Design a protein around this ligand. Structure first.
Ligand SMILES: Nc1ncnc2c1ncn2[C@@H]1O[C@H](COP(=O)(O)OP(=O)(O)O)[C@@H](O)[C@H]1O
Ligand SMILES: [Mg+2]
Ligand SMILES: [Mg+2]
Ligand SMILES: [Mg+2]
Ligand SMILES: [Mg+2]
Ligand SMILES: [Mn+2]
Ligand SMILES: [Xe]
Ligand SMILES: [Xe]
Ligand SMILES: [Xe]
Ligand SMILES: [Xe]
Length: 1284
């Protein structure tokens, strides 16, 4: 299929069927519902290659082959009306970026660009032209895609427009009116004083401004970029105030500077970490080693609220993507470690599952629903974290939408504009914490992706693999230590380059001169304004000395990170942009003019305070309340948000959300090890309580801080002054009451509580227009957010191993409540009130700052001394939920008495005051109570009773039974929300299976059987000789699990060498010098054209590297391992490997969802040399994949594979049987297959990651008796011994 396209040819190639049966049934169903009478629906990927030159037979076959991928779904002969869905013309999909990379790396330079569409074939035959538009509408996303009638209509996707010229705004010719006209025409959003400043500046300069200069200025003076509210002067109830919001936040550093290395000066904050073994490959040798040095800790938290409202997937993806850039661009280069994720939305209103507090209040047409946000956003955030390679380990998710009598009377409050929140921690070297000086003549570089027309203007675009490559360069740069060439670095975000690059020279006291046509652009029609000010993703800006440029270029080429030198730093503090194409100068400005400031804002405002009403209990019974609270999404099980995101990459994850044998997602905070050779680490927690702010601003803010503290407290940290906070403020500024509440709330934490507790807030952010207006009848409606403080806490951890969870034990035990509420038992703005459509009266609050600190200190004392069996704090859903979730995590019963807690049982069970339940050994109860009394806690400590074996959740009040149910019943109710979300988002069959397994109380949870001694280092005689065989640790662009793979081979006595595919293509390395090869995990080319395919095919279609791999595998004494992406790649090179004739392929999981699980496997009999001695063993292992379903050609292949004895690992359920039920088997592989070997055992591929869990501390659940090494260490030691 080959056609003309301007001065290019366009090829059209068939692809594979695009829809699984269940996806088809969903479409047919939606069609029946909208009363469209569609008889049948079929879809098929189709691919469009824009060629700059012709392809020969050989190359034509190669391209065709590249585009045969995916599940082998049942194919069909097209019938009915064709509707072709493609990206919007003038847009380039991420798929296209990555697939085009692969063509290039397979030596197909003739391919200018590849793009994909989906051809739908609809048989209805009944429909009107209007109804076909309704069909067309179901089949695509209005914001990213369009629908065409013809395969040849795709030629619009590749039109090249002539570069548009710069456009001047005629101030000198029209006066002020021209600036007014441009302010509306270009949507610049300028204030009148901003327009005056510009009129004057350009009038002084004596010439007309260019559109680009105005646009740059407007986006730098947005509330988003300038933060005027946060620096404003205040008058509140007629009294001027001495400090701005920012000043009140800095107060916390002024009063608590301890441990902080950088604050308010950079893209992230930095605090002291620990001296540990930092593991990476030297520039010199390419050998990986430990570098004993300080690994200091950075932190940042960002939001992406507006874009998530319009296009939730890319909005959430880029929210995280931008924040990862911030982290990497801290100092002179740093390394992201773990992530966090947050969502706030209006009511879900799940079809079929509507809850008694949900009311449809309508919404704007321009925005998506709450349910669409929670279906697509989390997938997008996960897309970035998974494809980039950072584990997501903590998060919140709240739903709120209600008509409530709050500070400005009866109003709608909620999150029609949602919160989407992404943050993380990273590590940084001491000597890179400070930004270097920008030397005059410094080259100014853009690192990363090409410019496209992105910042419809709120629909973002993510390419995480691009950012990954960029990060490898940054890692190459900090790993050079004091030879790091990065003088200064900054992320590119709002305002794109028009903000980032003046920001950069300015921070350095320099100017720059720039050349527009040096910037990498994929859209040649862009105006200069568009090149300079677009908000395209995956870009950094930096300065490097001219003489380091040859180093920076070797680094980038080898990682295949694109970059451009676009200008020079000048002594003179001027900004210039030249254009070689139009031989002119779009920007010619002094910086003090460009960055000059209009007067600061003054806000002169007044307090509103809701009275709010006492809770009406007419319809409330304790039993009906328990059922309702557990069906509040805020309370309810969060699995749909957790298993979609990787939790194990880096091999440093110690505590993830999943807890215990039953992997229940209730961990109160995240923890990571500092290195792969220490038990020191880092921790993260979140606290958050917005609804309280509808009654009381300050209390909500204090509660957010306190809850972060209670969520982190059972971690071994020590001094509270180690705990550092991000404060992210969401508000409806201007909405009556909100501004005074904002001031009061910032003061409450900045001026008071945080200083009193010794808590620093060294980073933060604000998002100041959390409101939505639209027309419903011909009446206007507003949905206004509560003031929403989200606190994230971060800390150096002293000992990762001493972390407690909510997992109860049934040994002889005592359950003690710490009620920091002190009997107040407030019910206002609780889960309980919400769920009976009320706000209620008095909310919770920090009641006693000294006791709050006493609590933290006591907990630390008990954690260090090992005096606790379990911990869970009280938050949403109260003590009731706290106890229920512990019982869930411990798979046991609870027997408690709440008589000492008041006569008001409702209020005792459902208040959301601070505190928690501790479990201790019965024999320690007195000593623990005595210690808590020593820190002043006596009167709020209450003995409750005990955890017991069994399924009874029982609550008494001396002789009366308050509440009594099956723990399992409660646990299933608590799961219904995630079940319903999984059911409508994923393969329903899988969601139901997962849900239904939870109802079987007999589930023994994860358990282990070992055929060998986990502590016996069978490699030690060999290590002891000092002879260290090399292992080729092989990575392709996009690979992300290589450091921990290398660390595992290293512990077994290997010299791990960093072999990038570019090293093999450039002849710098040759497999002929190795006896051992490992292909690592990740998302090479973002899995595009099928996970592992581009990697493998770039090997195959380069005949010289192809031969290198064939020769290796054909030698008699070589060994190879392929894990995950590497398992996939190797399965796609089968032709090079002897004894692999029967091997399967690996394709989309049956669930149709990325599965990040801790899965139980067994070791099966096979020739596998790496699995020697382990056969019969049953242990859990890290699973992180979207495309691991084993697929065979037919039953004959499967039988043949099986009878040859090549299957090496299988998934089993917790009862220990081979299973295809989900998630025990996360991907749907036949016979539970997840590893296979060759006839001679010398090559083995597996989908799970043993390299992520070779340390016991990096197993989510593990038996108490295991030492440093897990069972999976034996794989690597088997390799060592086998080489001999
Ligand atoms: N949006 C999210 N993404 C990832 N994990 C989340 C998210 N929301 C909640 N979680 C995780 O689910 C578990 C339960 O969350 P939640 O009940 O909100 O925690 P808590 O009540 O302790 O503040 C926690 O381990 C939390 O980190
Ligand atoms: Mg100190
Ligand atoms: Mg909770
Ligand atoms: Mg908690
Ligand atoms: Mg919380
Ligand atoms: Mn009191
Ligand atoms: Xe300007
Ligand atoms: Xe962490
Ligand atoms: Xe104790
Ligand atoms: Xe290996």
């Amino acid at each position: 299929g080959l056609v003309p396209r301007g001065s290019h040819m366009m090829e059209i190639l068939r692809g594979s069927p695009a829809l699984s049966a269940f996806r088809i049934n969903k479409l047919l169903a939606r069609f029946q519902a909208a009363n469209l009478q569609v008889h049948n629906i079929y879809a098929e990927y189709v691919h469009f290659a824009d060629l700059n030159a012709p392809l020969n037979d050989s190359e034509q076959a190669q391209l065709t082959r590249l585009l045969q991928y995916g599940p082998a779904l049942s194919s069909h002969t097209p019938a009915g009306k064709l509707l072709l869905v493609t990206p919007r013309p003038g847009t380039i999909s991420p798929w296209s970026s990555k697939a085009t990379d692969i063509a290039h790396n397979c030596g197909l330079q003739q391919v200018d660009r590849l793009e994909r569409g989906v051809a739908y074939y609809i048989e209805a035959s009944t429909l009107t032209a209007e109804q076909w538009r309704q069909v067309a509408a179901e089949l695509h996303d209005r914001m990213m895609e369009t629908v065409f009638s013809s395969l040849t209509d795709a030629e619009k996707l590749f039109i090249h427009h002539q570069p548009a010229p710069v456009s001047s705004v005629d101030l000198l010719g029209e006066g002020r009116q021209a600036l007014i006209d441009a302010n509306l025409r270009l949507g610049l959003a300028l204030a009148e004083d901003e327009i005056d400043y510009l009129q004057e500046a350009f009038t002084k300069l004596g010439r007309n401004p260019n559109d680009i200069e105005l646009y740059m200025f407007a986006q730098a003076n947005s509330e988003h970029c300038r933060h005027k509210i946060f620096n404003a002067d205040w008058i509140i109830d007629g009294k001027p105030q001495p400090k701005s919001l920012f000043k009140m936040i800095k107060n916390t550093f002024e009063t608590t500077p301890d441990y902080v290395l950088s604050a308010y000066k950079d893209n992230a904050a930095v605090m002291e970490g620990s001296a540990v073994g930092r593991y990476f490959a030297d520039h010199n040798t390419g050998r990986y080693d430990f570098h004993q040095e300080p690994a200091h800790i950075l932190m940042k938290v960002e939001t992406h609220n507006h874009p998530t409202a319009i296009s939730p997937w890319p909005g959430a993806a880029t929210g995280s993507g931008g924040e990862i850039r911030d982290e990497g661009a801290t100092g002179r280069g740093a390394k992201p470690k773990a992530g966090l994720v947050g969502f706030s939305v209006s009511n879900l209103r799940i079809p079929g599952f509507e809850q008694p507090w949900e009311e449809d209040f309508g919404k704007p047409e321009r925005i998506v629903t709450a349910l669409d946000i929670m279906t697509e956003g989390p997938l997008g955030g996960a897309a970035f974290n998974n494809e980039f390679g950072r584990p997501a380990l903590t998060g919140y998710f709240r739903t709120y939408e209600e008509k409530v009598n709050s500070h400005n009377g009866e109003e709608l409050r909620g999150y029609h504009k949602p919160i989407m929140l992404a943050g993380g921690i990273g590590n940084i070297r001491a000597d890179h914490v400070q930004k270097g000086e920008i030397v005059v003549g410094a080259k100014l570089i853009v690192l990363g992706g090409p410019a496209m027309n992105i910042g419809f203007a709120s629909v973002q675009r993510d390419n995480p693999e691009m950012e990954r490559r960029c990060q490898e360069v940054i890692d190459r740069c900090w790993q050079l230590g004091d030879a790091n060439p990065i003088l200064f670095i900054h992320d590119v975000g709002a305002g794109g380059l028009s903000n980032a690059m003046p920001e950069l020279v300015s921070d350095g006291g320099r100017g720059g001169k720039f050349e527009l046509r040096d910037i990498l652009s994929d859209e040649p029609g862009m105006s200069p304004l568009e090149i300079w000010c677009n908000e395209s993703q995956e870009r950094y800006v930096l300065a490097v000395a001219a003489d380091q440029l040859p180093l920076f270029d070797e680094l980038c080429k080898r990682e295949r990170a694109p970059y451009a030198v676009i200008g020079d730093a000048t002594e003179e503090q001027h900004l210039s942009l030249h254009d070689n194409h139009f031989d002119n100068q779009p920007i010619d400005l002094p910086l003090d003019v460009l960055l000059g400031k209009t007067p600061k804002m003054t806000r002169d405002v007044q307090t509103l305070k809701a009275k709010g009403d006492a809770l009406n209990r007419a319809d409330i019974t304790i039993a009906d309340a328990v059922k309702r609270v557990l069906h509040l999404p805020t309370v309810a099980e969060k699995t749909f948000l957790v298993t979609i995101g990787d939790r194990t990459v880096t091999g440093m994850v110690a505590r993830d959300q999943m807890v215990g044998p039953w992997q229940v997602p209730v961990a109160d905070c995240a923890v990571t090890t500092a290195s792969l050779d220490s038990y020191y680490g880092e921790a993260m927690s979140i606290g958050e309580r917005a609804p309280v702010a509808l009654l009381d601003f300050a209390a909500s803010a204090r509660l957010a801080v306190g809850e972060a503290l209670t969520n982190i407290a059972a971690t071994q940290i020590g001094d509270i002054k180690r705990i550092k906070l991000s404060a992210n403020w969401m508000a409806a500024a201007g909405h009556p009451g909100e501004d005074a509440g904002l001031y009061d709330a910032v003061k409450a934490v900045g001026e008071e509580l945080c200083p009193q507790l010794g808590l620093t807030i060294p980073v933060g952010k604000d998002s100041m227009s959390m409101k939505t207006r639209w027309q419903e009848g011909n009446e206007q409606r507003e949905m206004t957010s509560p003031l929403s403080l989200v606190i994230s806490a971060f800390a150096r951890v002293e000992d990762v191993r001493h972390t407690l969870t909510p997992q109860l034990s049934t040994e002889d035990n005592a359950l003690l409540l710490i009620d920091l509420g002190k009997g107040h038992n407030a019910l206002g703005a609780t889960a309980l009130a919400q769920v009976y459509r009320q706000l209620g009266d008095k909310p919770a609050d920090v009641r006693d700052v000294a006791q709050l600190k006493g609590f933290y200190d006591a907990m630390q004392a008990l954690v260090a001394a090992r005096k606790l069996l379990a911990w869970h704090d009280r938050s949403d859903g109260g003590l009731l939920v706290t106890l229920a979730e512990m019982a869930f995590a411990g798979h046991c019963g609870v027997q408690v008495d709440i008589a000492a807690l008041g006569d008001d049982h409702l209020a005792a069970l459902f208040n959301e005051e601070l505190g928690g339940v501790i479990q201790v050994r019965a024999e320690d109860r007195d000593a623990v109570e005595a210690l808590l009394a020593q820190y002043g806690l006596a009167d709020c400590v209450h003995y409750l009773g005990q955890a017991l074996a069994g399924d009874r959740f029982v609550i008494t009040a001396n002789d009366q039974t308050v509440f009594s149910e099956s723990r399992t019943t409660l646990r299933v109710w608590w799961a219904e929300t995630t079940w319903q979300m999984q059911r409508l988002r994923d393969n329903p069959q899988c969601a139901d299976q997962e849900h239904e397994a939870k109802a079987n109380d007999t589930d023994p949870g994860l358990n282990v059987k070992l055929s060998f001694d986990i502590n016996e280092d069978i490699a030690a005689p060999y290590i002891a000789t000092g002879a260290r065989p090399k292992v080729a640790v092989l990575r392709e662009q996009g690979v992300n699990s290589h450091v921990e793979m290398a660390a595992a081979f290293h512990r077994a006595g290997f010299d791990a060498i960093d072999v990038h595919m570019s090293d093999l293509l450039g002849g710098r390395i040759g497999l002929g010098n190795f006896h051992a090869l490992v292909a690592c995990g990740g998302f090479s080319y973002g899995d595009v054209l099928g996970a592992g395919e581009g990697w493998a095919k770039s090997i195959l279609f380069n005949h010289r590297v192809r031969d290198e791999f064939e020769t290796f595998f054909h030698r008699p004494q070589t060994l190879a391992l392929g894990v995950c992406n590497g398992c996939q790649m190797m399965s796609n090179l089968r032709e090079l490997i002897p004894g692999s004739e029967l091997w399967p392929r690996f394709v989309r999981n049956h669930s149709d969802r990325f599965e990040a699980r801790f899965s139980l496997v067994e070791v099966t009999q096979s020739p596998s040399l790496l699995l020697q001695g382990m056969v019969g063993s049953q242990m859990p292992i890290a699973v992180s994949h979207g495309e691991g379903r084993v697929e065979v050609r037919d039953d004959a292949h499967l039988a043949a594979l099986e009878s040859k004895g090549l299957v090496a690992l299988r998934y089993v359920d917790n009862f220990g049987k081979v299973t295809e039920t989900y998630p025990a088997n996360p991907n749907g592989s036949p016979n539970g297959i997840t590893a296979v070997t060759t006839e001679n055992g010398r090559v083995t591929i597996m989908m799970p990651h043993p390299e992520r869990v070779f340390r016991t501390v990096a197993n989510s659940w593990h038996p108490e008796n295991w030492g440093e090494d897990s069972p999976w260490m034996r794989i690597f030691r088997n390799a060592r011994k086998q080489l001999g």
